[model samples]
Target chain A: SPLSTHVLNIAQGVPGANMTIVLHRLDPVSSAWNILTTGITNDDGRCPGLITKENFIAGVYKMRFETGKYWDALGETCFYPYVEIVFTITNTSQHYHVPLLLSRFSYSTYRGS
Target chain B: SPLSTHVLNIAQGVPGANMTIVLHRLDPVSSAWNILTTGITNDDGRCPGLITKENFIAGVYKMRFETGKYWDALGETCFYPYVEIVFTITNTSQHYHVPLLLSRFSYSTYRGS
Candidate 1:
């Protein structure tokens, strides 16, 4: 896979499971965003189908995590209503991984292997 | 000290040292950003003076990492030119720890106790 993502609940030391994630691609010319697809995190906190081969382009993209809903379901009060991460992909040959380490009050993401 | 951050190079399995980071605060009224302070990750990848007592206000903040320079110094070819993280700090009483797990192609961050 060219791109992939996962959520890790560092506070609880568990994989952020049963959460909703939406992936979007940026239109460089129009300076707009197009919703590509959405997937739910499984028990491993990974969305296997988040990015398909055709949609994996070497460009800018964003991921929106339904953090409010996710925390609310777990009876946790968090600071963010949602979490969004924007990243660029330039190397088509190498696979990219974006993982989120999250907690009730904070979250962080980075380009992954 | 209510806010702090550290950087870890997961790819190298070591602390991301001597990396520059710029912190900024958002002005809610004007919808603008105010530069707060600049710090560098030490051998431990931690910056102790990034936030001070007087400036630890409850609001939104951003961290701009000079990833390009850091990777270049380490002779690494990375995907991002730089990295930015915008997060909200609501509870002024609780200490927030933000750690960035970084690599040449990936990174992850989370709130820590």
Candidate 2:
């Protein structure tokens, strides 16, 4: 099983490329957050290496997207500085694909195939 | 200036009512997150009292939505335990409306008006 993500700039009707993303895992016992990996969106606004088969586990994980910095690079003013999503992974046997639809003022994300 | 938010359950195609929402303000000097207000969605899936005319200011603010709690109450499984959005307010003369479109697997938010 593996976990991957994609981002689309809905306002521009294009993939959200060059966006920075950080992945983290939570220590259930200690209630601490630990960084898992960091990556940037490619030309297609997709990041595929966050979690691999060996590291995928059933637990709580977090994904942080650097949206403000991306918008800033485009000379656009955005409300959101960053976006964080905390989710649970109950089935390590199933692959997870999370995609984000973003804009200067708004953004949307969902569990995809 | 005032700030309001709405949440829609795209998976169910209805307003996301009874969902808990927390609002916060960021102190630029200290870079700290401060809780400003908290509320639950109404029948319309909208929280209207996050910010008032007198309390609204031009600064950084955060919105935390308790999606997992809402889903748990509905007897549904959700990936995200919570969703956090961090944004800025630079214009006190205008009203800001942020809306979230959510599902058990996916979610999105954007500036409405």
Candidate 3:
């Protein structure tokens, strides 16, 4: 019913804690972007309350990560300023677990269980 | 360098081929998701000529795969019906080799040199 996200730093073999993640959804008709909510990574690199069922409607979404800020905090110069992931939701009752496998140079995500 | 993607089915210890892939880019002004191109995975579990330097712009993009379709073709079942990844591009001049380390139950992606 709700959405969840986890960030793992493969390069360092650590959890990407204290990272900022913002979730935005698209206005299907007008095509305008709307900021839905924000979730900060915990010690386990998981965002607890990503989006509740009441507000997590079916639509297209973009999850933006403050990756540059994370790298900067680690005293590293990363390639990209930040990371954005766009995805679609069709089933409201299904749990969508989209997690990130992150690094200084690159990152990726997939639908998780 | 142009963007490239390789799919490895770690669960079966084989390359993922014949898989369909789609790349979409977000429009700057309208915040619309535009289809950039599509590719069919090859023997090496890769899709080439994903995007040219000239067309790979500076903005947000998403990569999607019909994982459910592939698993169905393989006569197996997976948790995710599909896969979607959203990323950012700043310096299109550099290489962006984002690859998938896939499995029936889990998957991962990262930036490559």
Clashes of each: 5, 8, 2
Clashing residue pairs found in predicted model 3: A84-B86, A85-B86
Residue A11 shift from truth in candidate 2, angstroms: 2.7
Instruction: Tell me the tens digit of each residue's lDDT in model 3 across B10-80.
Output: 98798999999999998999967889899999999999889888888888778888887888899986655
DockQ of 2: 0.83
Q: So what's the TM-score on candidate 2?
A: 0.92
Cα RMSD for candidates in order: 3.9, 1.7, 4.6
**Interface quality of candidate 1 as DockQ:** 0.31
Off by over 4 Å in 2: none
Give per-residue lDDT, candidate 2, residue B9.
Answer: 91
TM-score of each: 0.71, 0.92, 0.68
Ranking by DockQ: 2, 1, 3
Which digits, one per residue and each the tens of the lDDT, describe model 2 over residues A1-113?
28888899988899999999999999989978999999999999999777778888789998899999999999987788888878898878777887778888777777765
Worst 10 residues of 1 chain A by lDDT: A77-86
lDDT of 3 by residue, A1-113 (tens): 38899899888998999899999998989967899988899999988988878999887887888888888899986655577666667778788888878888667676765
Docking class of 2: high
Q: Tell me how candidate 3 scores on lDDT.
A: 0.81
Best by DockQ: 2
Model 3 misses residue B35 by how many Å? Answer: 0.3
- Better structure of 2 and 3 per lDDT: 2
The DockQ of each candidate is 0.31, 0.83, 0.22
